[PDB]
Design an enzyme around this catalytic site. Structure first.
Site, short mmCIF file in Angstrom:
data_model
loop_
_atom_site.label_atom_id
_atom_site.label_comp_id
_atom_site.label_asym_id
_atom_site.label_seq_id
_atom_site.Cartn_x
_atom_site.Cartn_y
_atom_site.Cartn_z
N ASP A 35 41.35 18.53 -54.83
CA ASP A 35 41.56 17.39 -55.53
C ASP A 35 43.26 17.84 -55.27
O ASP A 35 43.47 19.13 -55.38
CB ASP A 35 41.59 17.15 -56.76
CG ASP A 35 42.70 15.85 -57.24
OD1 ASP A 35 43.22 16.07 -56.44
OD2 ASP A 35 42.29 16.56 -58.39
N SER A 199 57.93 8.29 -47.59
CA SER A 199 57.92 7.75 -46.70
C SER A 199 58.95 6.89 -46.29
O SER A 199 60.06 6.95 -47.38
CB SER A 199 56.38 7.14 -47.27
OG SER A 199 56.71 5.94 -45.95
N1 LIG Z 1 44.35 13.31 -58.57
C1 LIG Z 1 44.84 14.23 -59.27
C2 LIG Z 1 45.59 13.66 -60.24
C3 LIG Z 1 46.03 12.53 -61.09
C4 LIG Z 1 45.99 11.16 -61.47
C5 LIG Z 1 47.56 12.03 -60.70
C6 LIG Z 1 48.97 11.53 -61.83
F1 LIG Z 1 48.28 10.22 -62.40
F2 LIG Z 1 49.57 11.85 -62.90
F3 LIG Z 1 49.89 10.90 -61.25
C7 LIG Z 1 48.28 13.02 -60.17
C8 LIG Z 1 46.80 13.77 -59.95
#
Ligand SMILES: NCc1ccc(C(F)(F)F)cc1
EC number: 3.4.23.22
Length: 330
Positions: A35, A199
Protein backbone atom coordinates in the site's frame (compact mmCIF):
# COMPACT_ATOMS: atom_id res chain seq x y z
CA UNK A 1 21.16 -5.56 -3.00
CA UNK A 2 17.75 -6.04 -4.62
CA UNK A 3 14.44 -7.84 -4.22
CA UNK A 4 11.66 -9.03 -6.49
CA UNK A 5 8.27 -10.50 -5.59
CA UNK A 6 5.20 -11.55 -7.55
CA UNK A 7 1.92 -9.86 -6.65
CA UNK A 8 -1.39 -11.56 -7.43
CA UNK A 9 -4.96 -10.20 -7.60
CA UNK A 10 -7.13 -11.49 -4.77
CA UNK A 11 -10.22 -12.01 -6.95
CA UNK A 12 -11.54 -11.80 -10.51
CA UNK A 13 -12.05 -8.01 -10.35
CA UNK A 14 -8.52 -7.03 -9.20
CA UNK A 15 -9.98 -5.63 -5.97
CA UNK A 16 -6.55 -5.92 -4.31
CA UNK A 17 -3.14 -7.51 -4.83
CA UNK A 18 -1.34 -9.72 -2.30
CA UNK A 19 2.42 -10.29 -2.16
CA UNK A 20 4.13 -12.98 -0.04
CA UNK A 21 6.35 -11.60 2.72
CA UNK A 22 8.61 -13.58 5.05
CA UNK A 23 8.57 -12.48 8.71
CA UNK A 24 10.56 -13.93 11.59
CA UNK A 25 13.01 -16.78 12.14
CA UNK A 26 12.16 -19.36 11.01
CA UNK A 27 10.19 -17.64 8.25
CA UNK A 28 6.45 -17.17 8.61
CA UNK A 29 5.00 -16.34 5.19
CA UNK A 30 2.07 -13.93 5.10
CA UNK A 31 0.31 -12.49 2.04
CA UNK A 32 0.33 -8.72 2.48
CA UNK A 33 -1.32 -5.87 0.57
CA UNK A 34 1.43 -3.48 -0.59
CA UNK A 35 0.00 0.00 0.00
CA UNK A 36 1.81 3.12 -1.22
CA UNK A 37 -0.95 5.16 0.48
CA UNK A 38 0.00 4.27 4.07
CA UNK A 39 3.13 3.71 6.13
CA UNK A 40 2.36 0.95 8.65
CA UNK A 41 3.34 -2.72 8.35
CA UNK A 42 0.60 -4.45 10.33
CA UNK A 43 -0.37 -8.11 10.35
CA UNK A 44 -2.96 -10.47 11.74
CA UNK A 45 -1.31 -12.20 14.68
CA UNK A 46 -1.81 -14.59 17.59
CA UNK A 47 -2.79 -11.45 19.52
CA UNK A 48 -5.77 -10.57 17.30
CA UNK A 49 -9.07 -11.25 19.05
CA UNK A 50 -10.25 -14.66 17.89
CA UNK A 51 -13.68 -13.57 16.63
CA UNK A 52 -12.06 -11.03 14.27
CA UNK A 53 -10.03 -13.72 12.44
CA UNK A 54 -11.62 -15.76 9.61
CA UNK A 55 -9.09 -17.81 7.64
CA UNK A 56 -6.16 -15.39 7.65
CA UNK A 57 -2.61 -16.56 8.23
CA UNK A 58 -1.43 -15.11 11.54
CA UNK A 59 2.00 -13.98 12.70
CA UNK A 60 3.05 -15.73 15.92
CA UNK A 61 5.90 -13.72 17.50
CA UNK A 62 6.41 -16.37 20.20
CA UNK A 63 7.63 -18.79 17.50
CA UNK A 64 10.21 -16.34 16.10
CA UNK A 65 13.69 -16.28 17.64
CA UNK A 66 14.32 -12.77 16.26
CA UNK A 67 11.09 -11.12 17.46
CA UNK A 68 11.36 -8.47 20.17
CA UNK A 69 8.49 -6.62 21.80
CA UNK A 70 8.87 -2.86 21.30
CA UNK A 71 8.09 -2.01 24.90
CA UNK A 72 5.34 0.57 25.36
CA UNK A 73 4.69 1.15 21.66
CA UNK A 74 1.14 1.16 20.30
CA UNK A 75 -0.40 1.86 16.92
CA UNK A 76 -3.84 2.90 15.72
CA UNK A 77 -4.74 3.56 12.09
CA UNK A 78 -7.90 4.46 10.17
CA UNK A 79 -8.13 4.28 6.39
CA UNK A 80 -10.07 6.54 4.04
CA UNK A 81 -12.74 3.87 3.55
CA UNK A 82 -13.48 3.70 7.29
CA UNK A 83 -11.38 0.59 7.96
CA UNK A 84 -9.29 0.53 11.14
CA UNK A 85 -6.92 -1.62 13.18
CA UNK A 86 -4.70 -1.27 16.25
CA UNK A 87 -2.40 -3.16 18.59
CA UNK A 88 1.16 -3.38 19.89
CA UNK A 89 4.51 -3.46 18.10
CA UNK A 90 7.27 -6.02 17.65
CA UNK A 91 10.57 -5.78 15.82
CA UNK A 92 11.55 -8.73 13.64
CA UNK A 93 13.30 -9.72 10.44
CA UNK A 94 11.25 -9.11 7.29
CA UNK A 95 12.11 -10.31 3.79
CA UNK A 96 10.46 -9.47 0.46
CA UNK A 97 11.58 -11.45 -2.57
CA UNK A 98 15.10 -12.01 -1.23
CA UNK A 99 15.52 -8.51 0.25
CA UNK A 100 15.95 -8.75 4.03
CA UNK A 101 15.57 -6.00 6.65
CA UNK A 102 16.44 -6.70 10.29
CA UNK A 103 14.69 -4.90 13.13
CA UNK A 104 11.64 -3.91 11.08
CA UNK A 105 8.66 -2.67 13.07
CA UNK A 106 5.91 -5.31 12.77
CA UNK A 107 2.66 -3.93 14.17
CA UNK A 108 0.63 -6.78 15.66
CA UNK A 109 -3.11 -6.23 15.20
CA UNK A 110 -5.07 -6.80 18.40
CA UNK A 111 -8.27 -5.38 16.88
CA UNK A 112 -9.27 -5.16 13.21
CA UNK A 113 -12.36 -3.75 11.54
CA UNK A 114 -15.03 -5.90 9.92
CA UNK A 115 -13.81 -5.32 6.35
CA UNK A 116 -10.44 -6.93 7.10
CA UNK A 117 -12.02 -9.89 8.93
CA UNK A 118 -14.25 -10.77 5.97
CA UNK A 119 -11.26 -10.68 3.56
CA UNK A 120 -9.54 -14.00 4.24
CA UNK A 121 -6.99 -13.52 1.44
CA UNK A 122 -5.22 -10.49 2.97
CA UNK A 123 -3.07 -11.21 6.04
CA UNK A 124 -2.00 -7.60 6.48
CA UNK A 125 -0.66 -4.43 4.92
CA UNK A 126 2.85 -3.28 4.01
CA UNK A 127 2.91 0.50 3.89
CA UNK A 128 5.13 2.17 1.29
CA UNK A 129 4.26 5.86 1.71
CA UNK A 130 6.66 8.16 3.55
CA UNK A 131 7.51 7.33 7.15
CA UNK A 132 6.03 10.61 8.42
CA UNK A 133 2.59 8.92 8.23
CA UNK A 134 3.48 5.97 10.48
CA UNK A 135 1.12 5.71 13.45
CA UNK A 136 3.42 4.11 16.05
CA UNK A 137 3.49 6.09 19.30
CA UNK A 138 5.43 7.40 21.12
CA UNK A 139 8.36 6.55 18.79
CA UNK A 140 7.52 6.77 15.09
CA UNK A 141 8.74 3.83 13.01
CA UNK A 142 10.23 3.59 9.53
CA UNK A 143 8.69 1.72 6.62
CA UNK A 144 10.20 -1.36 5.00
CA UNK A 145 11.37 0.79 2.07
CA UNK A 146 13.01 3.36 4.33
CA UNK A 147 14.87 0.69 6.31
CA UNK A 148 16.03 -1.07 3.12
CA UNK A 149 17.01 2.13 1.29
CA UNK A 150 20.71 2.19 2.18
CA UNK A 151 21.36 -1.42 1.13
CA UNK A 152 19.42 -1.12 -2.14
CA UNK A 153 21.49 -0.71 -5.28
CA UNK A 154 19.18 2.20 -6.17
CA UNK A 155 16.69 3.78 -3.72
CA UNK A 156 13.71 2.84 -5.90
CA UNK A 157 10.90 0.34 -6.07
CA UNK A 158 8.66 -0.32 -9.05
CA UNK A 159 5.04 -1.44 -9.34
CA UNK A 160 4.05 -3.54 -12.37
CA UNK A 161 0.46 -4.54 -11.64
CA UNK A 162 -1.34 -6.94 -13.94
CA UNK A 163 -4.83 -6.76 -15.41
CA UNK A 164 -6.55 -9.97 -14.22
CA UNK A 165 -3.03 -11.41 -13.98
CA UNK A 166 -0.07 -11.55 -11.59
CA UNK A 167 2.45 -8.72 -11.52
CA UNK A 168 5.77 -7.72 -9.96
CA UNK A 169 7.10 -5.48 -7.20
CA UNK A 170 10.83 -4.85 -7.61
CA UNK A 171 13.13 -3.22 -5.05
CA UNK A 172 16.47 -1.63 -5.87
CA UNK A 173 16.49 -1.80 -9.67
CA UNK A 174 14.51 -0.85 -12.78
CA UNK A 175 13.70 -3.75 -15.12
CA UNK A 176 14.20 -2.21 -18.56
CA UNK A 177 12.43 -5.19 -20.17
CA UNK A 178 9.15 -4.53 -18.33
CA UNK A 179 8.05 -1.42 -20.27
CA UNK A 180 8.01 0.14 -23.74
CA UNK A 181 9.49 3.47 -24.77
CA UNK A 182 10.82 5.92 -22.20
CA UNK A 183 10.01 6.50 -18.55
CA UNK A 184 8.58 9.97 -17.90
CA UNK A 185 9.49 11.32 -14.47
CA UNK A 186 7.46 13.94 -12.60
CA UNK A 187 8.02 15.74 -9.32
CA UNK A 188 6.62 14.47 -6.01
CA UNK A 189 5.42 16.50 -3.03
CA UNK A 190 5.98 14.78 0.32
CA UNK A 191 4.18 17.51 2.29
CA UNK A 192 1.23 15.26 3.18
CA UNK A 193 3.34 12.09 3.44
CA UNK A 194 1.96 10.63 0.19
CA UNK A 195 3.43 9.97 -3.24
CA UNK A 196 1.67 13.13 -4.41
CA UNK A 197 2.06 14.43 -7.96
CA UNK A 198 0.29 16.55 -10.58
CA UNK A 199 -1.18 15.05 -13.74
CA UNK A 200 -1.12 17.32 -16.77
CA UNK A 201 -4.61 16.55 -18.10
CA UNK A 202 -6.89 13.90 -19.52
CA UNK A 203 -8.88 12.68 -22.51
CA UNK A 204 -11.95 10.48 -22.89
CA UNK A 205 -11.90 7.84 -25.61
CA UNK A 206 -10.61 9.34 -28.85
CA UNK A 207 -11.54 12.87 -27.74
CA UNK A 208 -9.37 15.95 -27.44
CA UNK A 209 -6.85 16.06 -24.61
CA UNK A 210 -7.86 18.62 -21.97
CA UNK A 211 -4.79 20.30 -20.48
CA UNK A 212 -5.58 20.80 -16.80
CA UNK A 213 -3.68 20.18 -13.57
CA UNK A 214 -4.94 17.30 -11.44
CA UNK A 215 -3.22 16.89 -8.08
CA UNK A 216 -3.44 13.37 -6.70
CA UNK A 217 -1.62 10.49 -5.05
CA UNK A 218 -0.27 7.23 -6.47
CA UNK A 219 -1.92 4.63 -4.22
CA UNK A 220 -1.50 0.90 -4.88
CA UNK A 221 -3.78 0.24 -1.89
CA UNK A 222 -6.82 1.87 -3.51
CA UNK A 223 -8.74 -0.13 -6.10
CA UNK A 224 -10.44 2.56 -8.15
CA UNK A 225 -9.59 5.90 -9.78
CA UNK A 226 -11.01 8.90 -7.90
CA UNK A 227 -10.97 12.17 -9.85
CA UNK A 228 -12.73 15.55 -9.59
CA UNK A 229 -16.43 15.71 -10.36
CA UNK A 230 -15.92 17.64 -13.61
CA UNK A 231 -13.62 14.97 -15.06
CA UNK A 232 -15.77 12.04 -13.91
CA UNK A 233 -18.94 13.61 -15.32
CA UNK A 234 -17.23 14.14 -18.69
CA UNK A 235 -16.21 10.48 -18.82
CA UNK A 236 -19.54 8.94 -17.88
CA UNK A 237 -21.45 11.27 -20.20
CA UNK A 238 -19.94 9.22 -23.06
CA UNK A 239 -21.53 5.97 -21.78
CA UNK A 240 -25.13 5.37 -22.85
CA UNK A 241 -27.37 4.91 -19.83
CA UNK A 242 -24.69 5.74 -17.25
CA UNK A 243 -25.81 7.64 -14.16
CA UNK A 244 -24.69 8.42 -10.64
CA UNK A 245 -26.63 6.30 -8.14
CA UNK A 246 -27.03 7.45 -4.54
CA UNK A 247 -28.14 3.99 -3.38
CA UNK A 248 -25.13 2.26 -4.95
CA UNK A 249 -22.72 5.06 -4.02
CA UNK A 250 -21.28 6.04 -7.38
CA UNK A 251 -21.60 5.84 -11.14
CA UNK A 252 -23.16 2.67 -12.58
CA UNK A 253 -23.75 1.74 -16.20
CA UNK A 254 -25.60 -0.91 -18.23
CA UNK A 255 -23.48 -4.04 -18.29
CA UNK A 256 -24.17 -4.24 -22.05
CA UNK A 257 -22.42 -0.92 -22.74
CA UNK A 258 -18.85 -0.73 -24.01
CA UNK A 259 -16.59 1.63 -22.14
CA UNK A 260 -14.29 4.25 -23.67
CA UNK A 261 -10.67 4.43 -22.66
CA UNK A 262 -9.35 7.10 -20.29
CA UNK A 263 -6.07 8.91 -20.89
CA UNK A 264 -4.18 10.79 -18.19
CA UNK A 265 -1.13 13.00 -18.67
CA UNK A 266 2.32 12.63 -17.15
CA UNK A 267 4.26 15.70 -18.16
CA UNK A 268 4.13 15.54 -21.96
CA UNK A 269 3.51 11.78 -22.01
CA UNK A 270 0.15 10.01 -22.07
CA UNK A 271 -0.97 6.87 -20.22
CA UNK A 272 -4.01 5.15 -21.75
CA UNK A 273 -6.33 3.11 -19.51
CA UNK A 274 -8.26 0.62 -21.70
CA UNK A 275 -12.01 0.78 -21.22
CA UNK A 276 -12.13 -2.84 -20.05
CA UNK A 277 -10.07 -1.84 -16.98
CA UNK A 278 -12.92 0.45 -15.87
CA UNK A 279 -15.58 -2.32 -15.77
CA UNK A 280 -16.02 -3.66 -12.24
CA UNK A 281 -18.90 -5.99 -13.03
CA UNK A 282 -22.47 -6.25 -11.80
CA UNK A 283 -23.33 -4.37 -8.62
CA UNK A 284 -24.98 -7.59 -7.41
CA UNK A 285 -25.12 -11.18 -8.63
CA UNK A 286 -27.35 -11.35 -11.70
CA UNK A 287 -27.78 -7.58 -12.00
CA UNK A 288 -27.62 -5.86 -15.38
CA UNK A 289 -26.16 -2.72 -13.76
CA UNK A 290 -22.36 -2.63 -13.59
CA UNK A 291 -20.10 -0.57 -11.33
CA UNK A 292 -17.67 1.93 -12.84
CA UNK A 293 -13.95 2.05 -12.09
CA UNK A 294 -13.73 5.86 -12.31
CA UNK A 295 -15.53 7.66 -9.48
CA UNK A 296 -15.72 11.16 -8.01
CA UNK A 297 -13.24 12.30 -5.35
CA UNK A 298 -15.58 15.05 -4.10
CA UNK A 299 -16.49 13.08 -0.98
CA UNK A 300 -12.84 12.22 -0.25
CA UNK A 301 -11.00 15.55 -0.50
CA UNK A 302 -8.04 14.19 -2.48
CA UNK A 303 -7.68 12.62 -5.92
CA UNK A 304 -6.48 9.01 -5.91
CA UNK A 305 -4.67 7.32 -8.80
CA UNK A 306 -5.50 3.81 -7.63
CA UNK A 307 -4.97 0.38 -9.16
CA UNK A 308 -7.24 1.12 -12.15
CA UNK A 309 -4.73 3.73 -13.31
CA UNK A 310 -1.48 2.22 -12.03
CA UNK A 311 -1.97 -1.20 -13.63
CA UNK A 312 -2.04 0.48 -17.05
CA UNK A 313 1.59 1.56 -16.52
CA UNK A 314 5.01 0.58 -15.26
CA UNK A 315 5.43 2.88 -12.24
CA UNK A 316 8.75 3.85 -10.63
CA UNK A 317 8.70 5.11 -7.04
CA UNK A 318 12.04 6.95 -6.82
CA UNK A 319 12.90 7.46 -3.16
CA UNK A 320 16.00 9.57 -3.75
CA UNK A 321 16.63 12.70 -1.66
CA UNK A 322 14.45 14.51 -4.20
CA UNK A 323 11.69 11.92 -4.78
CA UNK A 324 10.10 11.48 -8.21
CA UNK A 325 7.48 9.28 -9.87
CA UNK A 326 8.20 7.55 -13.18
CA UNK A 327 5.52 6.35 -15.59
CA UNK A 328 5.95 4.21 -18.68
CA UNK A 329 3.66 2.43 -21.09
CA UNK A 330 3.84 -1.36 -21.07
N1 LIG B 1 -4.51 3.18 0.55
C1 LIG B 1 -4.18 3.98 1.72
C2 LIG B 1 -5.01 5.26 1.77
C3 LIG B 1 -6.38 5.21 2.00
C4 LIG B 1 -7.12 6.38 2.04
C5 LIG B 1 -6.49 7.60 1.85
C6 LIG B 1 -7.28 8.90 1.90
F1 LIG B 1 -8.62 8.63 1.93
F2 LIG B 1 -6.94 9.59 3.03
F3 LIG B 1 -6.99 9.66 0.80
C7 LIG B 1 -5.13 7.65 1.62
C8 LIG B 1 -4.39 6.48 1.57
Amino acid sequence: STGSATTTPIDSLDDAYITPVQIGTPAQTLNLDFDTGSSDLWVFSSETTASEVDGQTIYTPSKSTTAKLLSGATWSISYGDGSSSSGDVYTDTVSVGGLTVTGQAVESAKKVSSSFTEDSTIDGLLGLAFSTLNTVSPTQQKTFFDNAKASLDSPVFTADLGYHAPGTYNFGFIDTTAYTGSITYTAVSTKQGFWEWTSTGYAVGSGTFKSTSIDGIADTGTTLLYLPATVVSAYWAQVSGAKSSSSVGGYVFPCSATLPSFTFGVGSARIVIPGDYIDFGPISTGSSSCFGGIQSSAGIGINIFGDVALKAAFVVFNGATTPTLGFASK
